[PDB]
Amino acid sequence: EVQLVESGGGLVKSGGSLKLSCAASGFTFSSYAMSWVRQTPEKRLEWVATISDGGRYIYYSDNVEGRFTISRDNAKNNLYLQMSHLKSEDTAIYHCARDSSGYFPYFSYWGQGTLVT
Amino acid sequence: EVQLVESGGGLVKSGGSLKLSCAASGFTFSSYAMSWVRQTPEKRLEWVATISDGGRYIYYSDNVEGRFTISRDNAKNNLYLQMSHLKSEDTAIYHCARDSSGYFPYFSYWGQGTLVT
Amino acid sequence: NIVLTQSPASLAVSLGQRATISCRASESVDHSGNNFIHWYQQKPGQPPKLLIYLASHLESGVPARFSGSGSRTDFTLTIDPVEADDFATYYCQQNNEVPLTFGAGTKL
Amino acid sequence: AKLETVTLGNIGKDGKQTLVLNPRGVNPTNGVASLSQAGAVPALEKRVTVSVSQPSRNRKNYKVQVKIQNPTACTANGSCDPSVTRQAYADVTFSFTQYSTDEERAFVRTELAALLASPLLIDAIDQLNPAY
Amino acid sequence: AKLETVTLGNIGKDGKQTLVLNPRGVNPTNGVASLSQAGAVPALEKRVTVSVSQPSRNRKNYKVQVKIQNPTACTANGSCDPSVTRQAYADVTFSFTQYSTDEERAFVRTELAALLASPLLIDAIDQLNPAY
Amino acid sequence: AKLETVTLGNIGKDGKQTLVLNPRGVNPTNGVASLSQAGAVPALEKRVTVSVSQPSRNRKNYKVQVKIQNPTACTANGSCDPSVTRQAYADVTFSFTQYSTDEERAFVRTELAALLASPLLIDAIDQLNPAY
Amino acid sequence: AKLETVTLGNIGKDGKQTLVLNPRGVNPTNGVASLSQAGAVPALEKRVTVSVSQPSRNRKNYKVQVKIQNPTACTANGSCDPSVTRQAYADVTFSFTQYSTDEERAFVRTELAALLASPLLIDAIDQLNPAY
Amino acid sequence: AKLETVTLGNIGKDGKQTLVLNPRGVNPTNGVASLSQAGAVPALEKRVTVSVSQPSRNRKNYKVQVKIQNPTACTANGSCDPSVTRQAYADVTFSFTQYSTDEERAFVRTELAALLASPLLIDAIDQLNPAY
Amino acid sequence: AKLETVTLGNIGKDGKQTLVLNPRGVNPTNGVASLSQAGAVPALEKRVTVSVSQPSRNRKNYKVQVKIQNPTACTANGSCDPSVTRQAYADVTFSFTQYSTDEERAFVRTELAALLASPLLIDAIDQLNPAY
């Protein structure tokens, strides 16, 4: 079964840095594209970033692009998200999604997520 | 390569006479039609004359027809332009063009030109 | 004479924006199904080169960022983003009739 | 992988058309996966097949094989329903040995995806001009 | 078109490599354009061929055919020149009839270029897993 | 010479029609140059071929050979796309020896261009009347 | 039409020559009109033939066929009458079906008359260079 | 590459003569590509051919061959045609292996091209003096 | 003439290398005069020979022959001696008649020496591209 077990999170003040991960077991990780999807405590879903198959083509959103990076490790099956500058609005759950077979994704599978502040 | 090296030019008073030429190396000269194209010092391009394959069909412009002749030598690969009466307006550069395969030309290749006054 | 009238006299863009230039024919130029309007480029210390023949066909030396279209009166040339070599003058000529009238040309 | 909808974008001579392929199961008789379009009549569908064959006691090589079939339709005089007039096929066969690593297999996949968008191959296929 | 040099970019699994290809002239026996890698000895380089056929009395339709091969060099001990260990092949063949338009042939070329980057054909080619 | 666009003017029974022929490369298998029109569908094009053959150990003569193929198109009842109904061919073969000068070869070229515009030949081809 | 005399003007490479042609009557064996040069002995003159065919049980279409020949006379020493050294030939053949109109057949005749004065076919015929 | 017109400059004994060669098509059976000078009476022309073995995967030896032949004309008395008294041949044949590199091939070419300007071989060919 | 030391300058691919050849005596049986480069281990040296037919009264054909061969060394493991992996040959053979003049022979030599600097043959040998 497709399973995405995240890690990281915690209580970090503004201007700091983080690194999340995603376990991604149950399928060939190095074939599919990946994504980070966030959910505010106001209960609205927003998009963060996508990374392609080999890590070549990367799409960020507007409120992410200046200060976050996304990467992956196809031999350790992990899916990272380095954070910086933490401008007091990103206090989400940060789900780890599996992208659909296609040109822009529609998020077939999901994960539990890690609370950040 | 198609190359058109002109000669002639100089400072000639009105009412005189000249003869230009064109080197025309790099292709079978006796297959294509030829042309003289002038460029005024006011930076506008004008047409002078065309001569056909064997020198049979000849087209002049209006300000050229009464006093210029055009000729060619298919054994020496030259392309001439005899001038007369030099009525103070023709002070151009006189490019030597190679005509396109067709019924009226569109001037595929060009040359440096010779300043006349 | 079929007088070709350039709609601008001079134009200036940056290295990113597109660039348009139009010629206006005195008469109809499209003869049977094809229109006889050609495009030239003259750098100031060089003889002119041919860019677009028969109003839509690129010459083999052109780096294929040029294009053209039109029908019987008005013929344009569009340059998707202008590079460093593209700053020159641009003449258009007329091939349908015997006197072979040319254009006035613009600058960049 | 697993058969799901392969929605392909930026298709066409201009590059604005998309195509969605809905899965139609795997044939057990020869191991050929199947994708197809969303038509009702089965003869008007654009279908894609794909199959990779293990090395048997005769062939000794792995063999990925992808096929593409695109029909076009038009109705004639005195006829009501559209028939099928043309077929534009495609047939890609890969071949690797037992000792090839996966980077050698991913080089050939991304080389072929880059040749098909090069001005030497978009002129021999769109315009049908040999490379001269 | 014209046999020029071909720089294939964003090639490979990671997508950071290049593969530059110089033309090697057509063949008067078959009419097959050929290309090879920029800087390598003969018979140890990556080859790309392409050939377009017209109708005849045999076949009533056109046929474009690309065919790439790329070896692997193993510098053994006690020898100055490398040997080849194995080849990897990919031969595409298209088939278009004489009434097919320009946007039907370009639809096939661009569908195949967009399909080779899909997780159905990633996992089928560089991993050799079939589609279930 | 070199293949470029051969735009022919003053064509037709009245003499006001033009035709532009865009080059489509040289076939290496038999040395036949090719010009064609600007259609999309390859069966609706007006094409011209031309080839001159060197004297081999069998034929002993130079042989220029020009062919012209003009199809016409019309759609029928219950049909959408236009098909091809007629073919109006032309086939000119020249033949010269090794010792012929170029003025002998240019006399035959300009003689044939002058016979085709004479009232004896514009009546046998336009009206299909034998010369009686 | 009528077998009259034919004055071909602007003939030759320079385009200043003439070639006048008197009729020599049709042939009841084949129906081939013939012409010859005005003032020359028989078997040392320039010949022009033309023949139009109708459909039959063999061929379903028309066939116009022009065929010109013109020798070269070498007055050798020790002989009063010249000999021929070599011939030069040009045989056009047109093919039109029974439903072809008047402006389709005149388009072929005038395209061929305008094509023989193009730098593709100047350089192919009087210079014997192929088209590259 | 593709055949084009080759203008050889400052050739000759004094070094102030030219030789303009036009292309003459590829022989389809053996692959030999011809060049010839634009001179009338094609029995007597400066002729240059070039022949390269085709790039195959299992070819062991690559072989380039260049031939030059130049006839001399003789207007013999009693004949309207010039004849060929004698020829002047040249036969250059290279030979490489499939592991040879570009600089090993370019060294042999520029060595042979610099021996022919050396005073050993402008005296062994022009004056026919054997080296001793 | 008499053999001397020949210094070939600006030879190579880039054109900035030398080749100093010392004389190595005349072979008394066939008359072939050798040159060789001063390199140690005489199994691997640049070697150039030249051979001219002797001037006799009743000789019909004069024939010059030049040969070049260049080995490449390989220090194989387990041996104290370098070996020869491969050669790189060149075989130039002229052919004249006894009525040929000095300028007819000097034209062929300076033509072959100017073809080898032309871009037709710096691409047919260095890159192994057949002309088409």
mmCIF file of N, CA, C and O in Angstrom, chain G residues 73-77 85-86 127-130 132, chain H residues 3-5 22-25 38 42 78 80-81:
data_model
loop_
_atom_site.group_PDB
_atom_site.id
_atom_site.type_symbol
_atom_site.label_atom_id
_atom_site.label_comp_id
_atom_site.label_asym_id
_atom_site.label_seq_id
_atom_site.Cartn_x
_atom_site.Cartn_y
_atom_site.Cartn_z
ATOM 1 N N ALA G 73 27.028 18.679 -88.616
ATOM 2 C CA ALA G 73 27.667 18.350 -89.881
ATOM 3 C C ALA G 73 29.161 18.631 -89.806
ATOM 4 O O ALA G 73 29.571 19.729 -89.422
ATOM 5 N N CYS G 74 29.966 17.642 -90.185
ATOM 6 C CA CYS G 74 31.420 17.764 -90.195
ATOM 7 C C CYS G 74 31.919 17.520 -91.610
ATOM 8 O O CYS G 74 31.997 16.370 -92.056
ATOM 9 N N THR G 75 32.266 18.596 -92.309
ATOM 10 C CA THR G 75 32.769 18.500 -93.676
ATOM 11 C C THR G 75 34.211 18.017 -93.616
ATOM 12 O O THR G 75 35.138 18.804 -93.404
ATOM 13 N N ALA G 76 34.406 16.713 -93.787
ATOM 14 C CA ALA G 76 35.741 16.142 -93.730
ATOM 15 C C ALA G 76 36.512 16.458 -95.007
ATOM 16 O O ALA G 76 35.941 16.799 -96.045
ATOM 17 N N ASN G 77 37.833 16.341 -94.916
ATOM 18 C CA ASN G 77 38.681 16.576 -96.074
ATOM 19 C C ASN G 77 38.606 15.397 -97.034
ATOM 20 O O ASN G 77 38.572 14.237 -96.618
ATOM 21 N N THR G 85 28.004 13.743 -87.274
ATOM 22 C CA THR G 85 28.895 13.276 -86.226
ATOM 23 C C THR G 85 28.110 12.757 -85.031
ATOM 24 O O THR G 85 28.451 11.712 -84.467
ATOM 25 N N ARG G 86 27.030 13.443 -84.678
ATOM 26 C CA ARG G 86 26.288 13.164 -83.463
ATOM 27 C C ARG G 86 24.911 13.795 -83.573
ATOM 28 O O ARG G 86 24.721 14.782 -84.285
ATOM 29 N N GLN G 127 24.884 22.830 -69.075
ATOM 30 C CA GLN G 127 26.107 22.672 -68.304
ATOM 31 C C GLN G 127 26.291 21.274 -67.743
ATOM 32 O O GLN G 127 27.398 20.952 -67.302
ATOM 33 N N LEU G 128 25.232 20.462 -67.725
ATOM 34 C CA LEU G 128 25.222 19.077 -67.243
ATOM 35 C C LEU G 128 25.612 18.956 -65.773
ATOM 36 O O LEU G 128 26.150 17.935 -65.350
ATOM 37 N N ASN G 129 25.319 19.975 -64.973
ATOM 38 C CA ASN G 129 25.531 19.838 -63.538
ATOM 39 C C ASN G 129 24.236 19.405 -62.871
ATOM 40 O O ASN G 129 23.179 19.956 -63.185
ATOM 41 N N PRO G 130 24.261 18.435 -61.965
ATOM 42 C CA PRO G 130 23.046 18.095 -61.227
ATOM 43 C C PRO G 130 22.702 19.162 -60.205
ATOM 44 O O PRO G 130 23.486 20.064 -59.908
ATOM 45 N N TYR G 132 22.103 20.270 -56.529
ATOM 46 C CA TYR G 132 22.391 19.933 -55.142
ATOM 47 C C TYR G 132 21.727 20.945 -54.220
ATOM 48 O O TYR G 132 21.268 20.603 -53.134
ATOM 49 N N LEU H 3 28.177 18.098 -50.919
ATOM 50 C CA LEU H 3 28.963 18.609 -52.033
ATOM 51 C C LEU H 3 28.576 20.046 -52.345
ATOM 52 O O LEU H 3 27.393 20.393 -52.367
ATOM 53 N N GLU H 4 29.582 20.889 -52.552
ATOM 54 C CA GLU H 4 29.401 22.265 -52.983
ATOM 55 C C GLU H 4 30.439 22.553 -54.055
ATOM 56 O O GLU H 4 31.252 21.692 -54.399
ATOM 57 N N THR H 5 30.417 23.765 -54.596
ATOM 58 C CA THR H 5 31.413 24.151 -55.582
ATOM 59 C C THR H 5 32.715 24.486 -54.874
ATOM 60 O O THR H 5 32.733 25.295 -53.943
ATOM 61 N N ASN H 22 32.595 21.798 -60.040
ATOM 62 C CA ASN H 22 31.199 21.720 -59.655
ATOM 63 C C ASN H 22 30.848 20.292 -59.256
ATOM 64 O O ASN H 22 31.500 19.349 -59.707
ATOM 65 N N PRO H 23 29.854 20.074 -58.397
ATOM 66 C CA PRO H 23 29.501 18.701 -58.027
ATOM 67 C C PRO H 23 28.785 17.964 -59.142
ATOM 68 O O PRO H 23 28.126 18.560 -59.993
ATOM 69 N N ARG H 24 28.939 16.640 -59.134
ATOM 70 C CA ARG H 24 28.357 15.796 -60.170
ATOM 71 C C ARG H 24 27.707 14.540 -59.602
ATOM 72 O O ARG H 24 27.729 13.496 -60.262
ATOM 73 N N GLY H 25 27.151 14.601 -58.401
ATOM 74 C CA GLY H 25 26.318 13.535 -57.892
ATOM 75 C C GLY H 25 27.095 12.341 -57.364
ATOM 76 O O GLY H 25 28.252 12.107 -57.699
ATOM 77 N N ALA H 38 33.766 22.985 -64.984
ATOM 78 C CA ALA H 38 32.863 23.497 -66.009
ATOM 79 C C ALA H 38 33.677 23.824 -67.251
ATOM 80 O O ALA H 38 34.086 24.965 -67.463
ATOM 81 N N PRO H 42 32.370 17.701 -72.748
ATOM 82 C CA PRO H 42 32.602 16.951 -71.497
ATOM 83 C C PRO H 42 33.472 15.700 -71.609
ATOM 84 O O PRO H 42 33.657 15.024 -70.593
ATOM 85 N N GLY H 78 41.555 16.987 -89.996
ATOM 86 C CA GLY H 78 40.589 16.084 -90.578
ATOM 87 C C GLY H 78 39.462 15.673 -89.661
ATOM 88 O O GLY H 78 38.670 14.800 -90.034
ATOM 89 N N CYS H 80 36.451 17.251 -86.724
ATOM 90 C CA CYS H 80 35.812 18.412 -86.122
ATOM 91 C C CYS H 80 35.842 18.372 -84.604
ATOM 92 O O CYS H 80 35.508 19.376 -83.965
ATOM 93 N N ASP H 81 36.240 17.249 -84.020
ATOM 94 C CA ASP H 81 36.225 17.039 -82.589
ATOM 95 C C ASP H 81 37.645 16.977 -82.060
ATOM 96 O O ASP H 81 38.492 16.311 -82.670
#
